[PDB]
Each structure stands twice: as C-alpha cells, then as structure tokens.
Design a binder for these strands. Structure first.
Ligand SMILES: Nc1ncnc2c1ncn2[C@@H]1O[C@H](COP(=O)(O)OP(=O)(O)O)[C@@H](O)[C@H]1O
Ligand code: BEF
Ligand SMILES: [Mg+2]
Ligand SMILES: [Zn+2]
Ligand SMILES: [Zn+2]
Lengths: 645, 645
RNA sequence: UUUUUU
C-alpha cells in the first residue's frame, strides 16, 4: 500500500494567496500504483494531493523534502519513477514524515518574517485565514465543522508572503466544531533533518551521576530483562523490573537463579515471593497495586516492554516516570525491541509463506492444509474467543490434538510437550512463554475507539481492524526462536505502530478508580509524565477531558464495582457506575447483555427509560437524558478536543 | 466499472445450516477486473461475495439467476469470462437485479415448506435465526446493531431444509438496533422472471377506455414535452402538462405557437397567461398552489420530467396520482428520458469529449480551453451557485459573454439569441431548451441526506457527491436538442438513477405545512399514492415517521415562517420552527449562520443555550435537550425505521 | 449549500 500523488494544489506566486486543484489520477493509476509503487507521472508544484487505497490527504515540499503526517502516511513508501521511494525522515513524536522531493518538485521557503496572520490551504484549494496563537496552534476566524478540514492533514500554513510556517495535523474542536488548528512548525522539520540518521542505544546505559530517563532498543532475547539487570545488580545496584505479563515475571526467578545465580523478588497478584535480593520482578499491575514507588528502594527501574499500548503498562510507566526521581532512583530505563514507527523486516530463522485457498481448513477467507499442522507444535492466532473455540473444535473433530487459549482460561490447557495446535487470541502473550514450530496468523486485531458522538456524550466501540507492526512482529515472533520456524499469513498488509486511541486513556482512568484507589487527578499526573516523554507511543492529549469525566462519577455502589471487577470485563468502573445510576433511579440498564449482569437480581424491580451516561455497547431500552450525571458528562463534552484530520 | 466476484460463502450440504467464506480476489484483482469487466476465475457456489469500487455485498443464485439488490449493484454489468455481463433483470421497484448465472455457479432451491423458522446468511458467514412475520419481513431473535448487517445485502434467507426464501435488502431499526429484516421474497424473483426482458414505452400511450397510469420513455430532445401534448390535443383531448422547471414552462409558451400552432395556457407564480387553449402547461408548484386536480378539467395529465426528485415534483406527482381518476382524467402519463434503472447511453446528436488537465480555465480538477466556448452558445454546469458566480466572473474577465443562472435570478438574464456562455446550477438541468452548442459538466452535485443521529434526534446534511445517471443524461441532454452538440465532462462514471433520500420526504411535509396548507396527514395520502406507483423513483418508506414529527410542530410563529418562505432556502418550516422555539425561550439559534437570519435583529436579547430540536447545520452554541418539543421528537425516533444496510 | 410554490 504505497502513497501516491494523485493531484496538486496550485498556489499563487504573487499578491493575495489563491489556490486551485488539478487532479492527475482518477483511481486509475491510483489504487494500481498504490501497489506497483511506480509513478510515471511527473511531479510539479509544491503542494501534493496524495492518497492511499483508503485515505487521501496532503503533503508539502520544504527544503527539497516532501513532508506529511505520520498518522496519515505511516512508514509507507512514496510512489515515483524508480518504483517505490523509501521515507528519509520518520518522526512519530512530532507526527511528521518526509520523502526526498521527486523530479520537478519545487519547495516553499521557511517563513522568516515572523508573521501572526497565517493561511491554511485545504485539499479543496480553500485558503483559510488562521490567527497564530502558539508555536503549533492557530485560531480559526470562521469556525468550521471538523468534516470540512478532513483530508487536509499535511497541508501548509503559509504566511502573507507565502512562506511555509508549518503543516496542518489536527483540529481543536468544540462539540465537533473546529475552532483552532494544531500544526507542525517548519522548525520541527529543520530539527528533523539535523538529527543523527542513526541513534544507537543497543547498550545498557551507564548509571548517570544524576537521575536520568534512558532508552534501550535491542532485539528480543538479548538479556534486556535478564542479563542487563544481572550486570547492574552485579555492580551492587538495586533493580526493580516491570513487565506486562505475569507469566513472564514469574518465569524470571527460576531463570535468574539459573544462568545468573540470584534469587530475585517476584511480585504478582497471584504470587508474591520476598527473598530479600537486590533485583525484583513485578508486573505493571502488581507495581500499581503496591502504590508505585517507595523510599529509595531502587536506583534502577527498567520498564520492560515499554512499547505495549495496554492501559495497564501505560499507566505503570507513567507512575514510574513521575515518581522514580523522588523515590531516590538514579536511572529509569525504557526497554523495548520495537519502538514506535518500527517496521516489519525479514527474520533469518523464519520462512514466511502466504496462505492460499487450497487447504482442508477454512481460515479467514483462505485455508490451512492439514499436513501443515498435523504433527508438530503450532500456534494459530484468531481475533476472537469464539473463533478460537470454533477452530479448536473443528481441529479436534479431525483427530488433531488442539486446544483454545484466551483470557479466562488457565495456561494448564496448553501442553508444554508433545504435538498440539494452540488456537489463541493475543492473550497468549501475557500468560504463556513457549514457542512453536510454526505460527498461522489471521492478521486482524480487535480494538476499541472512542467516538465523541454527542448522543448524549461519547461511545466506546469495538471493531476488528488489520494488525499493526507490533502485532505482526510479536505474533510471528512466537516461532523461529533458537531454531527454524514458519510463519503463514492471510494478508501481507501491515499498519503503522507507535500510536494508541483516546479510549485507552479512558481505560487508564477507569483502572485508577477501580483497582488502585487513584484519583483521576493522580492518574493525570502519571499519564502527563508518560505523554511528556519522547520515544514512547503517542496518543492525542485528552487528559483534561477524561479527568473531568471520571471526577464527577461520585459515590459508586461498591457491590456493583466488586461484581464488574471480578467478572473481569473492560471498563468495570464505567459499567459499575452506569449500573449504580440505574439502580438508584429504579431504572433498567441499557440492555440485558452480559455486560450488565450485575443488575440481574433487580431485573423485576427496574422499569422505564435508562438514564444513559454514555454508550459502551448496544442500547436496546428507551433512554432519558434528564439525570444530572448525564448533564454533567454533557458539560464535559464542551472542552477543547484535539482530533486528527 | 463492473461488479466483481471477489469471494463466496459456502453452505453446509447436510445437517444444521453452517457457512464459511472463501476469498478469491484481493483489491488489485478487484479493480483491474472491474474495468476490463473480464473475470476468468471459476465461479462456484450459490452465494457470491461481490464488490464495486466503493461497497461490498452479496449475491445469491436462484433458478439459474445470480441476484442482488439494486441499491448495491445499480444497473452495473458483472465481470465475466468473455467480458462484462449485462443485467438480465433490473426491477428497481423490488430493489432486485439479476444476471444470468455464470457457468459453474449453482442455484438454491426455493422454499416450499412455508416454514417460518428462517436463517439469514451474512457476509461474514454468520447464520442468524429469523422468525418469518410477513411475506417479506422477519424478526431477529437477537437484535443487533445495524452496522453488523452492513454489507450483507443480497444474502439469502433460508428455511431449515436449506431452501431459499428470499434475499436480504434492509434492516428495520429502533434507535439504531435492528430488530427485524426486510427481504425480497423468492416469489418476486419468479414474478420478475415471468415478465419480459425487453420493454418499450417509447410511443405515446393510447388513451384507454377506463382510467390508466402509463409511462413514456424517450431520449432527450425527442418531443415528449411538445409534440406529444400537441398530438393528443390535435385529437380532441384536453391536456395538462406538469413540469418541474419554470424556465421550461415559460419556454413552451412562445415555442408552441410557431412550432405546433398551439398557444397554450400557462401557469406559474410569475405568469398565469390564460388562452383557453386545450393544452395547459404548469409547474408542479403552481399546480399544488391551485390545490391540485379540479373536477372534469382534463382528459390527460402529463407528469413531465417524472425522473425529477425534488420535493415539489414528488408531492405534485403524488397529488395527480391520488386525485386524477376522481377528477375525470382518462390517462396519467409519467414521462421522462431517464426512468429509474436507466443508464447513460450514447445520444445520436451528441459527441462526448473528456476535459483534460490542459486549458486556460481550471474546472473541477481539470481544465477548460477558452477556444471551446469562445464562439457559439454554451452551457456550463457548476455544483454551487457560488461556483457559478466565480466562474462566470472569471469568464467575463476573459472577453467572454457569460451569465450565471440559478433560482432567485429571473429567467430573463439568459440571452435567447447569439453567442453566450451560461453558467448554471441544476435550475437548468431538466426540461429546458436554450439552443446550446455544447454542455460542459462538473459531474458533481449537491444533495441532502438524513442521518438518524439521536444527538438528539436527526441530522440533515448537505454534501456534494458524484452525479447520478439521470443527472449526466439530463445535463448532457441540454445540448444536441434538434441538432449536433458537444458534451464535455470531468469524470466518466455515474451513480445509479431512480433512488432518493428520506430527507426528501421530510421536505415534502415541510412544503406541505409551509406552502400548500396541507396537514401532515393529507401530505401522507399524496406521498402514499406516489410510493404505491410502479416505475417511479424509490425511497425508503418513512411516511409514518415523518408525519409523526410534523404533527407535533404546532403554533409556529407565522412571522418567522413568512420570512423563511420568502428567503427561499431549504426547510423553511423546520427552520422557522426552531426559530420559534428559540424566540419563545429567549435563546439564540444553533448558530449565527445565514440560515438563522430571521433571528438576527433579536440577537441582543437572546442568551443561554439553544433548545435544539434537530440538526440542520453546524451547531456552534451550547444546547439544552429539555424542551418539550425535543422530547416529542426523541419519542418519534423510537418508531420502526427501515434502513438499507 | 441544487430545484419551487411568493
Ligand atoms: N424553446 C425552444 N426553442 C427552440 N427549440 C425548441 C424549444 N423547445 C423545443 N425545441 C425543439 O423541439 C424539440 C423537442 O423538444 P422537447 O419536447 O423539449 O423534447 P423532450 O421533451 O423529449 O426532451 C427539441 O429537439 C428542440 O429542438
Ligand atoms: F427529455 Be427532454 F430533455 F425533456
Ligand atoms: Mg421534456
Ligand atoms: Zn513569512
Ligand atoms: Zn422450506
């Protein structure tokens, strides 16, 4: 899926700025060149209209480099003369990427005039007056529905003389009405050309004189969470180590005792073991449960797997980065083998073979030859538990030894030895360590996005989407470790890594409130520290908004919170709170799906419309918007919300 | 391009009904096949997954024919072995189309057990139990969000013994949750197959002995509006000719005397020329103002340009159909060059030439050579009346004699003789003969759609979209009327013809209340006559719903309504009604856009949040949802809304 | 941000 110039925006060269569009492709060579990656059309102008199979937006030439946004182009190559063109610059932290300017492409000159009267060119060749307010912010003179600004990410903010000031990346909205714009300044583009092409950090950082936050990018199985602590501790240092997976944390004492002769502390909600050693191993959950950091117990805190975008790890890291320095630590280390922007490379131990339609076993529109999985140990990733269950059952029906694994199931279901086909969701990763002769990958994930739907408030929706770079790589990575593997896939398609959704923030607050006695205010301090930190995965900054929502969720029914927590489903807080409001109102929940099971005893007692606070799934019952919490959350919706265009 | 088979759903041969999906084609194969209309892939199965360049849906083979929905496929060919296969059946009325099944495909057997326990097969191969409730309806046992049934159109509904009972076409919803499904019953396929493949309504209908509604289909500029009523008159009959356009209805006045030695009565708002001649011309608008049909006045009512789907035409045609027989008519003729299901075929008087990127005048991403309009008579369509102003001013600054026309301006602005470039909206799309050497066409237009967004009620949105087949053929047909002509265009395609949005039904009620003194109940009678008549454009049946809404909008401010009517913008009733509710609450309108100009003089005394009733544009002001009318409409949203998925 | 009753 290469990026393809499909047209251009003609700018005036003198006088008042005017623009008009010329379209050079009509889906013709578009979706086609989208693949070939060879663009036989000549590049004129300085503002390009670009498009992928799915998305269209803009790109701006400055200092002989074609620039656009990461959120829009990912790491995708640019189509041109000598086929696909690799990106020369890729800066997730700033939401900015750039290819080298193709034949005949002229650039704009960076604004030196320091003006505050700016103009935004959109993909409709509109020239929109913007009043600069910040270094990266400008107010609109005529507020517009956000929809008008869409497909315009990547377009230039010009000064009156027509010099590039920045590129458009996001709109600040009030109830979906764009009133300001966020942009990437040209100084960021300059800083990006001037950064060392390669920055090595494959090496355990020296313990700084004063407190440092440091990065550690090294491939899996390099001693990142084993050797590296065994060196630090060797130098008489106190090591805390935080990992996302209980299974992984536990399995450390036994290996550290082996290949490193230490008996470290292991902390989990399942098993605490205090051996009184310098090195400790704890999950993010457990670290959060223990209140975070405490009086100078550690000099080094490694955040293993710092790239995972689950609410638990995000919140854990944020607590570190905010506290470590005050807890008397000298070094914090953000460790990962797959930083943001990371891309899928071939791997030596792993042969990759696309599935076809020939096979005895239907699998996501393709098929799996039985000989490929009869005999051996194999791992098949499905996007849902129901799918795991269905395929495991079908395989058993064929006399193939097969088990389903997903959250709610105990690891024991997985045989550690002998022929097996394990059919699993991504939950495999947090609760099991072993590897397999091959991996078969459906290439899809289930994710959650927030929609600020105003009906009445917001909506959290679950959708099946193509996988991202982190997903392919960790799934493929369950084979070919210390031996030969095979990786079979349904699609070669991949997706940009490094970003997560606002709903994950929402999840962090929910968890702070449900599981850690964290105030929204406290959770903010910790997320703030995470967001303030370069190198990490990125999310729109909606802290104030989410903080404001959870703040007004007062006096929850403790019994309800207990039931939602135990049941273990998403948003136990928000689910329990909506349950509380309902019961107190003597009204029914949004529906009688299992999400609302904590209310089943009261079923005969509850009648009339639901006092709906927000949408966490299907709403079957009638609704009333008159509850004060509803109105409270409605008032929260009026805050500035930056959304990407 | 064509519709492409990109996969199939495989059904179980015995036992419980189960399904899985095979995907036979990626996206690249899809588009390439879509344009050559050449598909070599073996076709297997009774259920195909098909795709255009936009949507994807299903098609089911029955009795040797591969069937799907008109709302998905339009009248598109199906990519095949030798090349595109043209549809064999196109039944817009039943939302049903069919191609002769390619070799290899097999048919489902129709259900004759009359079982009322059914199973819907979705595009993701889920098998959803459904209880037959009517001939073409079934309730879902487990209601689901609409988005879940998306892309499942054309999929079969099967009885327990695996037969075909129908094909899915729409979801029947309550506040976004599908509780029932509408399908096209297998007996409509039989009925369709037992009427002929070719038909011709190209000759003027015989006056029948007893009352009849007939159709007249014949190419643009062939004599439908002139010769035909002249011939019927020449035979002793009294003819009423109803036309949507004021400019055409005025044209007929002077043209008919020299051309057919008839000087016809004329009725419009501006001119009510009476002659006593046996042919009366009238706009649908003046006809509605006059109160519709007057006893004994006419033998033949010609509803001219009945492809027109503006609200005045729908309501005027609906009025003829409900009234004509009782008023002593012998014959109602529905006349058009572009009936539902038709596509643009070559016109013997018209050469068609694609515009290119090369030329002096940028025109919608392409360009116009000034040499193509410098001499002669030319009509250029732009989507907006603003773009009309801009272009016509651009042209007038190049030595061209250009005039911009749209409604609001008088018909006199257009010179009848000598070189000219008229730059028009679709005020000049239909009916008009302005002796034009060439037509130049942006290929886009402006439409409104209703979204049932429950924030808090409904939303009417304006968007500019690619033109449909009626538009392309009608605009093009403004040239080459009695001679050779040139058609220049920006884009080659067209969307299917003969469908209109539910917002149009909303406009009819609005017009009924605003202009024609109709209660919402009276309006329903007329709209129902229209919806019950075969061969006319089709729409979702939201008649009960809209009527319920307008029935609750009482005690409007007659002053505001008088101003919104006079200003001539859309939804004068809805706008004035919202203005009424705001004024009485001393609250501001949703915004201060020109839509709300009737309230401008009151600005200094209006404060607080808008009691929002519905969304008719951007809402900038804070809103409150407590107003009784808002709740009345919210309760209206709870009725069954059939929506196509 | 396209028609018609003003
Ligand atoms: N006002 C007019 N001025 C000049 N020629 C006209 C006028 N009206 C009709 N004609 C001629 O009469 C023919 C029939 O026109 P019309 O009845 O409007 O065709 P249709 O109704 O099939 O589109 C046209 O081909 C055109 O040449
Ligand atoms: F078909 Be004609 F242009 F009315
Ligand atoms: Mg006509
Ligand atoms: Zn400048
Ligand atoms: Zn049957």
């Amino acid at each position: 899926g290469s990026v393809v110039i499909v047209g251009r925006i003609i700018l005036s060269g003198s006088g008042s700025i005017t623009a008009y569009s010329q379209q050079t492709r009509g889906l013709l060579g578009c979706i086609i060149t989208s693949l070939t990656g060879r663009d036989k059309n000549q590049v004129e102008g300085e503002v390009q209209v670009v498009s992928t199979a799915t998305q269209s937006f803009l790109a701006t030439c400055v200092n002989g480099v074609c620039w656009t946004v990461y959120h829009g182009a990912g790491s995708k190559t640019l189509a041109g003369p000598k086929g696909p063109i690799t990106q020369m610059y890729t800066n997730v932290d700033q939401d900015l990427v750039g290819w080298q300017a193709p034949p005949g492409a002229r650039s704009l000159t960076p604004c030196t005039c320091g003006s505050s009267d700016l103009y935004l060119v959109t993909r409709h060749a509109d020239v929109i007056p913007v009043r600069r307010r910040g270094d990266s912010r400008g107010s609109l003179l005529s507020p517009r529905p956000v929809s008008y600004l869409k497909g315009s990410s990547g377009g230039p903010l010009l000064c009156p003389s027509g010099h590039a000031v920045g590129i458009f990346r996001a709109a600040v909205c009030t109830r979906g009405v764009a009133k300001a714009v966020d942009f990437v300044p040209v100084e960021s583009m300059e800083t990006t050309m001037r950064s060392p092409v390669f920055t090595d950090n494959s090496s355990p950082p020296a313990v700084p004189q004063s407190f440092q936050v440091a990065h550690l990018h090294a491939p899996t199985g390099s001693g990142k969470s084993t050797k590296v602590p065994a060196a630090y501790a060797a130098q008489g240092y106190k090591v805390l180590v935080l990992n996302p997976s209980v299974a992984a944390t536990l399995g450390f004492g036994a290996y550290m005792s082996k290949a490193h002769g230490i008996d470290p502390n292991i902390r989990t909600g399942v098993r605490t073991i205090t051996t009184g050693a310098p090195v400790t191993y704890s999950t993010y959950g457990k670290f959060l449960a223990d209140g975070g950091c405490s009086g100078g117990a550690y000099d080094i805190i490694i955040c293993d797997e710092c790239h995972s975008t689950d609410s638990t790890t995000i919140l854990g890291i944020g607590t570190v980065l905010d506290q470590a320095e005050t807890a008397g630590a000298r070094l914090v280390v953000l460790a990962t083998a797959t930083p943001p922007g990371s891309v899928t490379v071939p791997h030596p131990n792993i042969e990759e073979v696309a599935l076809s339609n020939t096979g005895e076993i239907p699998f996501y529109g393709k098929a799996i030859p039985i000989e490929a999985i009869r005999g051996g140990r194999h791992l098949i990733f499905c996007h849902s538990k129901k799918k795991c269950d269905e395929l495991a059952a079908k395989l058993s029906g064929l006399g193939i030894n097969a088990v389903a694994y997903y959250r709610g199931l105990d690891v024991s279901v997985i045989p550690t030895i002998g022929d097996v086909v394990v059919v699993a969701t991504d939950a495999l990763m947090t609760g099991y360590t072993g590897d397999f002769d091959s991996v078969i990958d459906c290439n899809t994930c289930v994710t959650q996005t927030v929609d600020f739907s105003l009906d009445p408030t917001f909506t959290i929706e679950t959708t099946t989407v193509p996988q991202d770079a982190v997903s392919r790589s960790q799934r493929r990575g369950r084979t070919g470790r210390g031996r030969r593997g095979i990786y079979r896939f349904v699609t070669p398609g991949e997706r940009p890594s490094g970003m997560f959704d606002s709903s994950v923030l929402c999840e962090c607050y929910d968890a702070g409130c449900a599981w850690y006695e964290l105030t929204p205010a406290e959770t903010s301090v910790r997320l703030r520290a995470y967001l303030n930190t370069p190198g990490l995965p990125v999310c729109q900054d909606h802290l104030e908004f989410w903080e404001s929502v959870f703040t007004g969720l007062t006096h929850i029914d403790a019994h309800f919170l207990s039931q939602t927590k135990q049941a273990g489903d998403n948003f136990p807080y928000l689910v329990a709170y909506q349950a509380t409001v309902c019961a107190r109102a003597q009204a029914p929940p949004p529906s009688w799906d299992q999400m609302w099971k904590c209310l089943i005893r009261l079923k005969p007692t509850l009648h009339g419309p639901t006092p709906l606070l927000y949408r966490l799934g299907a709403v079957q019952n009638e609704v009333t918007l008159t509850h004060p919490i509803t109105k409270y959350i409605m008032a929260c919706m009026s805050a500035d919300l930056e959304v990407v265009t």
